[PDB]
């Protein structure tokens, strides 16, 4: 019982567990690359003469 | 245009053909991008919408 981690340690463990999610609220390089890819190929083409 | 015709015995059209350059050039700049421009020199059909 007295070896139960202090709240700072639990906070660090939980933050480290959350960092490895892959489902962070904002887009990582994987998601932002494809969000850039689809906006690039959206709307009227630029090379269309 | 004023026509004089032999009187026939049934309602008839007068198939009139002008001389036009109803040409189209096809622009295909990238993959699955198909665009056509239709232009007819005496009688065009551009309505500027």
XYZ file of N, CA and C in Angstrom:
294
model
N 0.821 -1.205 0.000
C 0.000 0.000 0.000
C 0.857 1.258 0.000
N 1.921 1.283 0.802
C 2.781 2.457 0.827
C 3.700 2.539 -0.381
N 3.783 1.480 -1.180
C 4.485 1.518 -2.453
C 3.582 1.956 -3.597
N 2.352 2.355 -3.301
C 1.503 2.954 -4.316
C 2.159 4.236 -4.817
N 2.281 4.427 -6.128
C 3.039 5.574 -6.640
C 2.439 6.901 -6.204
N 3.317 7.860 -5.924
C 2.874 9.206 -5.607
C 2.228 9.836 -6.841
N 1.321 10.800 -6.651
C 0.532 11.290 -7.794
C 1.367 11.836 -8.938
N 2.533 12.423 -8.666
C 3.383 12.891 -9.756
C 3.861 11.731 -10.623
N 4.247 10.620 -9.992
C 4.701 9.454 -10.744
C 3.564 8.879 -11.574
N 2.367 8.793 -10.993
C 1.213 8.309 -11.743
C 0.900 9.230 -12.914
N 1.036 10.540 -12.707
C 0.832 11.500 -13.784
C 1.818 11.269 -14.917
N 3.091 11.050 -14.577
C 4.096 10.790 -15.604
C 3.806 9.494 -16.352
N 3.435 8.438 -15.624
C 3.124 7.161 -16.263
C 1.935 7.308 -17.201
N 0.895 8.019 -16.761
C -0.292 8.186 -17.592
C 0.002 9.036 -18.821
N 0.789 10.103 -18.666
C 1.151 10.916 -19.821
C 1.972 10.114 -20.820
N 2.909 9.299 -20.326
C 3.699 8.456 -21.217
C 2.829 7.418 -21.915
N 1.844 6.865 -21.203
C 0.926 5.916 -21.823
C 0.079 6.587 -22.896
N -0.370 7.814 -22.636
C -1.176 8.555 -23.595
C -0.378 8.997 -24.813
N 0.920 9.259 -24.655
C 1.718 9.725 -25.784
C 1.848 8.661 -26.867
N 1.853 7.384 -26.490
C 1.970 6.288 -27.441
C 0.628 5.876 -28.036
N -0.386 6.739 -27.955
C -1.728 6.348 -28.373
C -1.799 6.108 -29.874
N -1.315 7.069 -30.661
C -1.499 7.379 -32.094
C -2.780 8.167 -32.330
N -3.579 8.437 -31.302
C -4.855 9.110 -31.504
C -4.836 10.399 -30.689
N -3.800 11.203 -30.887
C -3.762 12.507 -30.261
C -4.794 13.429 -30.907
N -5.230 14.467 -30.188
C -6.305 15.318 -30.723
C -5.961 15.985 -32.041
N -4.694 16.301 -32.277
C -4.273 16.962 -33.500
C -3.478 16.002 -34.373
N -3.377 16.358 -35.649
C -2.803 15.461 -36.640
C -1.288 15.396 -36.500
N -0.762 14.179 -36.389
C 0.662 13.958 -36.427
C 1.143 13.953 -37.861
N 2.430 13.667 -38.075
C 2.949 13.668 -39.455
C 2.197 12.726 -40.378
N 1.816 11.546 -39.883
C 1.017 10.621 -40.680
C -0.284 11.265 -41.138
N -1.047 11.823 -40.197
C -2.350 12.370 -40.549
C -2.217 13.664 -41.339
N -1.277 14.533 -40.958
C -1.175 15.812 -41.650
C -0.638 15.637 -43.063
N 0.158 14.593 -43.312
C 0.612 14.339 -44.675
C -0.556 13.993 -45.589
N -1.495 13.177 -45.112
C -2.617 12.805 -45.967
C -3.659 13.918 -46.032
N -3.803 14.707 -44.963
C -4.656 15.886 -45.024
C -4.084 16.929 -45.976
N -2.764 16.975 -46.150
C -2.207 17.825 -47.194
C -2.377 17.190 -48.569
N -2.248 15.865 -48.647
C -2.352 15.182 -49.929
C -3.734 15.354 -50.539
N -4.788 15.204 -49.735
C -6.126 15.291 -50.310
C -6.520 16.727 -50.640
N -6.027 17.714 -49.886
C -6.298 19.097 -50.272
C -5.526 19.458 -51.533
N -4.350 18.862 -51.744
C -3.606 19.131 -52.971
C -4.390 18.651 -54.187
N -4.973 17.454 -54.106
C -5.723 16.878 -55.217
C -7.209 17.213 -55.162
N -7.575 18.339 -54.561
C -8.961 18.766 -54.468
C -9.175 20.034 -55.284
N -10.403 20.214 -55.759
C -10.755 21.381 -56.530
C -10.189 21.335 -57.933
N -10.325 22.432 -58.671
C -9.825 22.473 -60.050
C -8.325 22.246 -60.096
N -7.849 21.424 -61.034
C -6.423 21.117 -61.077
C -5.611 22.345 -61.437
N -4.382 22.458 -60.927
C -3.553 23.618 -61.284
C -2.949 23.518 -62.671
N -2.619 22.314 -63.132
C -1.985 22.130 -64.430
C -2.979 22.108 -65.582
N -4.275 22.194 -65.303
C -5.285 22.186 -66.356
C -5.229 23.501 -67.123
N -4.814 23.438 -68.386
C -4.739 24.624 -69.239
C -6.096 24.729 -69.927
N -32.594 35.193 -95.856
C -32.670 34.255 -96.969
C -34.112 34.190 -97.446
N -34.307 34.323 -98.754
C -35.618 34.192 -99.371
C -35.585 32.999 -100.312
N -36.471 32.038 -100.079
C -36.573 30.849 -100.908
C -37.840 30.899 -101.747
N -37.751 30.342 -102.947
C -38.910 30.053 -103.776
C -38.880 28.570 -104.101
N -39.990 27.886 -103.853
C -40.039 26.435 -103.919
C -41.202 25.997 -104.793
N -41.092 24.800 -105.350
C -42.244 24.197 -106.005
C -43.246 23.756 -104.945
N -44.526 24.097 -105.089
C -45.512 23.735 -104.060
C -45.700 22.227 -104.003
N -45.438 21.653 -102.835
C -45.577 20.221 -102.634
C -46.964 19.942 -102.056
N -47.258 18.678 -101.751
C -48.590 18.287 -101.304
C -48.621 17.862 -99.840
N -47.619 18.245 -99.056
C -47.586 17.924 -97.636
C -46.643 18.899 -96.949
N -46.806 19.115 -95.644
C -45.886 20.009 -94.933
C -44.467 19.465 -94.964
N -43.536 20.305 -95.405
C -42.138 19.926 -95.517
C -41.265 20.964 -94.834
N -40.200 20.490 -94.204
C -39.163 21.369 -93.701
C -38.245 21.778 -94.845
N -37.397 22.763 -94.580
C -36.304 23.118 -95.474
C -35.032 22.941 -94.661
N -34.351 21.818 -94.870
C -33.171 21.493 -94.084
C -32.024 22.413 -94.470
N -31.801 23.452 -93.674
C -30.781 24.446 -93.961
C -29.523 24.127 -93.169
N -28.385 24.091 -93.855
C -27.097 23.816 -93.232
C -26.170 24.986 -93.505
N -25.716 25.641 -92.446
C -24.721 26.692 -92.579
C -23.341 26.044 -92.621
N -22.292 26.853 -92.649
C -20.957 26.301 -92.585
C -20.265 26.729 -91.313
N -20.007 25.790 -90.407
C -19.492 26.130 -89.089
C -18.243 25.314 -88.796
N -17.389 25.862 -87.931
C -16.278 25.113 -87.348
C -16.672 24.719 -85.930
N -17.482 23.667 -85.827
C -17.867 23.126 -84.523
C -16.787 22.160 -84.037
N -15.703 22.741 -83.537
C -14.521 21.995 -83.148
C -14.405 21.926 -81.631
N -13.762 20.862 -81.157
C -13.490 20.647 -79.742
C -12.044 20.216 -79.599
N -11.354 20.770 -78.609
C -10.029 20.295 -78.241
C -10.077 19.788 -76.808
N -9.473 18.628 -76.582
C -9.614 17.889 -75.337
C -8.359 18.095 -74.506
N -8.527 18.648 -73.311
C -7.425 18.861 -72.385
C -7.478 17.793 -71.301
N -6.417 16.998 -71.203
C -6.294 15.943 -70.200
C -4.972 16.158 -69.479
N -4.924 17.106 -68.539
C -3.630 17.463 -67.937
C -3.080 16.405 -67.000
N -3.918 15.824 -66.145
C -3.454 14.809 -65.208
C -4.304 13.553 -65.305
N -4.107 12.625 -64.375
C -4.927 11.427 -64.334
C -6.364 11.792 -63.988
N -7.304 11.050 -64.577
C -8.754 11.222 -64.410
C -9.158 12.693 -64.293
N -8.619 13.502 -65.202
C -9.029 14.892 -65.380
C -9.312 15.061 -66.866
N -10.588 15.113 -67.229
C -11.015 15.218 -68.617
C -11.791 16.514 -68.790
N -11.315 17.375 -69.686
C -11.943 18.665 -69.934
C -12.006 18.911 -71.430
N -13.160 19.368 -71.906
C -13.371 19.665 -73.314
C -13.864 21.094 -73.472
N -13.401 21.757 -74.528
C -13.828 23.108 -74.870
C -14.504 23.058 -76.233
N -15.797 23.359 -76.266
C -16.566 23.351 -77.501
C -16.662 24.768 -78.042
N -16.372 24.933 -79.329
C -16.480 26.241 -79.957
C -16.916 26.070 -81.400
N -17.884 26.882 -81.814
C -18.450 26.841 -83.154
C -18.434 28.255 -83.713
N -17.645 28.471 -84.769
C -17.237 29.816 -85.163
C -18.381 30.740 -85.585
N -19.315 30.337 -86.456
C -20.418 31.250 -86.775
C -21.458 31.289 -85.670
N -21.792 30.120 -85.135
C -22.888 29.959 -84.188
C -22.350 29.315 -82.919
N -21.885 30.132 -81.983
C -21.366 29.631 -80.720
C -22.502 29.488 -79.721
N -22.226 28.795 -78.616
C -23.232 28.517 -77.598
C -22.632 28.794 -76.213
N -21.997 29.954 -76.080
C -21.477 30.373 -74.792
C -22.368 31.409 -74.140
N -22.901 31.093 -72.960
C -23.924 31.912 -72.325
C -23.401 32.736 -71.154
N -22.114 32.628 -70.832
C -21.463 33.441 -69.802
C -22.259 33.451 -68.496
N -22.330 32.283 -67.867
C -22.996 32.162 -66.577
C -21.957 32.126 -65.464
